[PDB]
C-alpha cells in the first residue's frame, strides 16, 4: 500500500504545526501590550499554561492513540488547535487568553504532536530513530514558518494581530487534519521491509508504567529539559551583560535554532547507526559543559555561537532520543502508551523551567544560579542516561505454548 515515507511526510507536517502554535506567542508579546496594560510576563503565561497542557495531554493522546488509532486521536487535535488558536482571534482578556490559546490550542498540540511519533518508527524498523525525528523536527521549524508569516499578517493595514490568529489558526487547522487523515500504523500482520523456541514480546504499558527504569527515564527527561528552558530564554541577554550590543548577541544566538532543528534528523541517523545509549548520555555531559563553558565563552559573538548551537543540538536531541530509548526499552506496540506517559515530563518542565530560571536571576542579579543549577540537572541527567541499559526483554509464555 502506501510508501513507507508518507508516514514521515506526515510526521514532518504535525509538528511543524505544533512548532506553529508554540512560537506563536512571542510574536503576540508586543502586539498585546499596545492594546492591553499587559506584561511581557502575563503573555509569557498563555505560553506556559499552553505547554503545560500540550506535554500532559501527550498522555491522554497516547493511550487514545494506541486503542484507537492515530488517525482519530491527530484530526481531533487539529479540531481543538484550529479551534483555541481561532478562538484567541476573538479576544478580549488575560483568561480568555489562558482559556483559548493556552488550554484549548494546547490540548490540540500535544494530540497533534504524540500519535506520529508512535506510529511512524512503526514503518521503519531498520531506522526506528531517524523516523522519529522526521516526527518532531517541525517543532524546530515552525519558527521559520511561523515567523514571516505573523509578521507579513501583523504589519498589514487591512489585518492585525488578531488576524494572525484568525488565518494562522485555519492554515494549522487544515494541516493537522491533513497530516491525521493519512496516518496509520502498518497492517496488523505483514512488515514493510526488503530484510529483518523462545518467544520474546513487547512490553505493555502497565509493564513498562511499573518498570524503574521508565522513571530514571523520566527523570533524566525532566531534568534535560528543566535546563534548556531554564537557560536558553538567558543566552541573548547574557551575551548583552557581557558587552555586546543587543543585534550582536540577538545574530550569536539565534544559531540555536538551526542546531536544534538539525539534530532532531542527525541524531536520529546516528544511533540508528551506533546505538543510543553512549552518544545521547555524551550529549547530556556536553549540555553540563556547555552551561559551565557560558561564563568563558559568552562574551563574544563567536563564543555566544558555539554556546547556542552546542545547547540547541544537546536540547533537541532529547526529543528524538527519549522516544528513541523507549522504542527501545519496550517496543513500538505500546510505544503510544509508554512515550505519551514519558511525554509529561516535558509538560512539567515547560511550565516551571523559564520562570524558575528568571527567578534565580532576579533573585541573585547575576547568571551564576539558573546556569549552574542547569549544569547540575545535567550532570544528573548525564549520570541516569548512561547509567540506564534496556531492561530484559519479555518472555511471551502465551505464545510460547502453542508449539505443540
Ligand atoms: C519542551 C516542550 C514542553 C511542552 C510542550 C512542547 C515542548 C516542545 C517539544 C519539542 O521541542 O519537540
Same mark, same amino acid.
Given at each position: 500500500?502506501?510508501?513507507?515515507?508518507? +508516514?514521515?511526510?506526515?510526521?514532518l507536517?504535525?509538528?511543524?504545526?505544533?512548532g506553529?502554535?508554540?512560537?506563536?506567542?512571542?510574536?503576540?508579546?508586543?502586539?498585546?501590550? #499596545?492594546?492591553?496594560?499587559?506584561?511581557?510576563?502575563?503573555?509569557?503565561?498563555?505560553?506556559?499554561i499552553?505547554?503545560?497542557?500540550?506535554?500532559?495531554?501527550?498522555? @491522554?493522546?497516547?493511550?487514545?492513540?494506541?486503542?484507537?488509532?492515530?488517525?482519530?486521536?491527530?484530526?481531533?487535535?487539529?479540531?481543538?488547535l484550529?479551534?483555541?488558536?481561532?478562538?484567541?482571534?476573538?479576544?478580549?482578556?488575560?483568561?480568555q487568553?489562558?482559556?483559548?490559546?493556552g488550554?484549548?490550542?494546547?490540548?490540540?498540540?500535544?494530540?497533534?504532536?504524540? @500519535?506520529?511519533?508512535?506510529?511512524?518508527?512503526?514503518?521503519?524498523?531498520?531506522?526506528?530513530?531517524?523516523?522519529?525525528?522526521?516526527?518532531?523536527?517541525?517543532?524546530?521549524?515552525?519558527?521559520? $514558518?511561523?515567523?514571516?508569516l505573523?509578521?507579513?499578517?501583523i &504589519?498589514?493595514?487591512?489585518?492585525?494581530?488578531?488576524?494572525? *490568529?484568525?488565518?494562522?489558526?485555519?492554515?494549522?487547522?487544515?494541516?493537522?487534519?491533513?497530516?491525521?487523515? *493519512?496516518?496509520?500504523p502498518?497492517?496488523?500482520?505483514?512488515? @514493510?521491509?526488503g530484510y529483518?523456541?523462545?518467544?520474546?514480546?513487547?512490553?505493555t504499558? &502497565?509493564?513498562?508504567?511499573?518498570?524503574?527504569?521508565?522513571?530514571?527515564?523520566?527523570?533524566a527527561?525532566?531534568?534535560?529539559?528543566?535546563?534548556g528552558?531554564?537557560?536558553?530564554?538567558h543566552? #541573548?541577554?547574557?551575551?548583552?551583560?557581557?558587552?555586546?550590543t543587543?543585534?550582536?548577541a540577538?545574530?550569536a544566538?539565534?544559531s540555536?535554532?538551526?542546531?536544534?532543528?538539525?539534530?532532531?534528523?542527525?541524531?536520529?541517523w546516528?544511533?540508528?547507526?551506533?546505538?543510543?545509549?553512549?552518544?545521547?548520555?555524551?550529549?547530556?555531559? $556536553?549540555?553540563?559543559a556547555?552551561?559551565?563553558?557560558?561564563?568563558?565563552?559568552?562574551?563574544?559573538?563567536?563564543?555566544?555561537?558555539?554556546?547556542?548551537?552546542?545547547?540547541?543540538?544537546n536540547?533537541?536531541?532529547?526529543?528524538?532520543?527519549? @522516544?528513541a530509548?523507549? $522504542?527501545?526499552?519496550?517496543?513500538?506496540?505500546?510505544?503510544?502508551?509508554?512515550?505519551?506517559?514519558? *511525554?509529561?515530563?516535558?509538560? $512539567?518542565?515547560? *511550565?516551571?523551567?523559564?520562570?524558575?530560571?528568571?527567578?534565580?536571576?532576579?533573585?541573585?542579579?547575576?547568571?551564576?544560579?539558573?546556569?549552574?543549577?542547569?549544569?547540575?540537572?545535567?550532570?544528573?541527567g548525564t549520570?541516569?542516561?548512561?547509567?540506564?541499559?534496556? +531492561?530484559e526483554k519479555?518472555?511471551?509464555?502465551?505464545? &510460547?505454548?502453542?508449539?505443540?
Amino acid at each position: 500500500t502506501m510508501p513507507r515515507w508518507v +508516514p514521515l511526510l506526515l510526521g514532518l507536517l504535525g509538528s511543524t504545526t505544533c512548532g506553529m502554535l508554540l512560537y506563536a506567542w512571542s510574536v503576540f508579546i508586543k502586539p498585546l501590550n #499596545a492594546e492591553f496594560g499587559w506584561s511581557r510576563a502575563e503573555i509569557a503565561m498563555a505560553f506556559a499554561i499552553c505547554c503545560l497542557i500540550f506535554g500532559l495531554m501527550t498522555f @491522554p493522546a497516547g493511550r487514545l492513540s494506541d486503542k484507537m488509532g492515530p488517525r482519530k486521536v491527530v484530526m481531533t487535535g487539529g479540531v481543538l488547535l484550529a479551534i483555541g488558536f481561532i478562538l484567541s482571534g476573538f479576544i478580549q482578556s488575560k483568561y480568555q487568553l489562558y482559556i483559548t490559546y493556552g488550554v484549548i490550542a494546547g490540548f490540540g498540540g500535544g494530540m497533534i504532536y504524540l @500519535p506520529p511519533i508512535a506510529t511512524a518508527p512503526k514503518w521503519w524498523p531498520d531506522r526506528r530513530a531517524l523516523a522519529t525525528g522526521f516526527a518532531v523536527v517541525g517543532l524546530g521549524l515552525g519558527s521559520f $514558518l511561523m515567523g514571516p508569516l505573523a509578521t507579513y499578517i501583523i &504589519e498589514k493595514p487591512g489585518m492585525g494581530w488578531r488576524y494572525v *490568529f484568525w488565518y494562522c489558526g485555519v492554515a494549522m487547522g487544515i494541516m493537522a487534519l491533513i497530516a491525521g487523515a *493519512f496516518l496509520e500504523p502498518p497492517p496488523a500482520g505483514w512488515k @514493510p521491509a526488503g530484510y529483518t523456541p523462545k518467544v520474546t514480546r513487547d512490553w505493555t504499558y &502497565e509493564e513498562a508504567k511499573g518498570d524503574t527504569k521508565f522513571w530514571l527515564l523520566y527523570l533524566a527527561y525532566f531534568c534535560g529539559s528543566f535546563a534548556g528552558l531554564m537557560v536558553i530564554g538567558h543566552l #541573548a541577554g547574557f551575551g548583552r551583560d557581557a558587552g555586546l550590543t543587543a543585534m550582536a548577541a540577538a545574530g550569536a544566538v539565534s544559531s540555536l535554532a538551526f542546531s536544534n532543528a538539525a539534530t532532531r534528523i542527525l541524531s536520529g541517523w546516528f544511533v540508528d547507526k551506533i546505538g543510543i545509549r553512549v552518544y545521547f548520555a555524551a550529549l547530556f555531559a $556536553l549540555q553540563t559543559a556547555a552551561m559551565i563553558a557560558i561564563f568563558q565563552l559568552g562574551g563574544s559573538v563567536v563564543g555566544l555561537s558555539i554556546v547556542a548551537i552546542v545547547i540547541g543540538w544537546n536540547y533537541g536531541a532529547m526529543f528524538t532520543l527519549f @522516544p528513541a530509548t523507549c $522504542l527501545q526499552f519496550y517496543g513500538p506496540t505500546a510505544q503510544g502508551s509508554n512515550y505519551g506517559l514519558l *511525554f509529561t515530563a516535558c509538560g $512539567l518542565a515547560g *511550565f516551571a523551567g523559564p520562570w524558575v530560571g528568571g527567578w534565580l536571576k532576579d533573585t541573585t542579579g547575576t547568571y551564576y544560579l539558573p546556569f549552574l543549577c542547569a549544569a547540575a540537572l545535567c550532570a544528573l541527567g548525564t549520570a541516569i542516561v548512561f547509567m540506564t541499559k534496556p +531492561p530484559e526483554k519479555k518472555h511471551a509464555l502465551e505464545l &510460547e505454548v502453542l508449539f505443540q
